[PDB]
Amino acid sequence: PLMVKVLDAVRGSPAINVAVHVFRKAADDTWEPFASGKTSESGELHGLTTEEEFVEGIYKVEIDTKSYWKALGISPFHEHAEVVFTANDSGPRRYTIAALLSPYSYSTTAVVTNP
Template identity: 30%
Template sequence: VPGADGAARTGPSPALPSLPQADGMSEVGKGTLTTHVLNTATGLPAAGLGIRLAQLQEPGLQWMELAHRHTDADGRCQPFLAQGQAKAGTYKLHFETAEYWQGLGHTSFYPFVEVVFIITDPAQKLHVPLLISPYSYTTYRGS
């Protein structure tokens, strides 16, 4: 199997060093709703990107903001909904991509990305990753 440098590798992979974020990851994993953002133009996590969570409220179908976070050096942030806090309903994650790209000295075709999703089982863990470049984005339901 080729390694990152293209050279063939045989035998077990060397152990990876412990990352400083590893301690915080146990907290991140305890949430009901988590995300992470990867800059696919560089292949690196998108650090410092602002994200807002809102829930669609009835009557009137108004969005109510529940939380605002910024990604850390690993492109992750603390959970948006803690264990037991989620309720069935429609939610959106609003990723502030224009500010992120401006901070890197780039312009972006998308001033923000909104991912709207439905929570049907509040006990189930949800992970909504976002992959971004200045001219594209991709999201999916992660694990």
């Protein structure tokens, strides 16, 4: 129900081994750790959560872009890329959070489908 896809606009490749942290806003308005992982050789991160665990809420997907660029010898502009959204407020959906990275720029889009 939640997938993250990361691409590299400099190399024209998947962004491999990118750390991703997901948080859910708690009743006390704090960010609770929800799930985390690293992108694969295809730039994708699957298996973060289940339909049962991925309840209504406000979620934050943090993509560790700075560590990614530093590993390639680029001192980038951003600390990270954060994507913050309400999920599953009209019932369960499938979410793909996609990011396209450059050293001084990033772009993000969502693909939301109803199973």
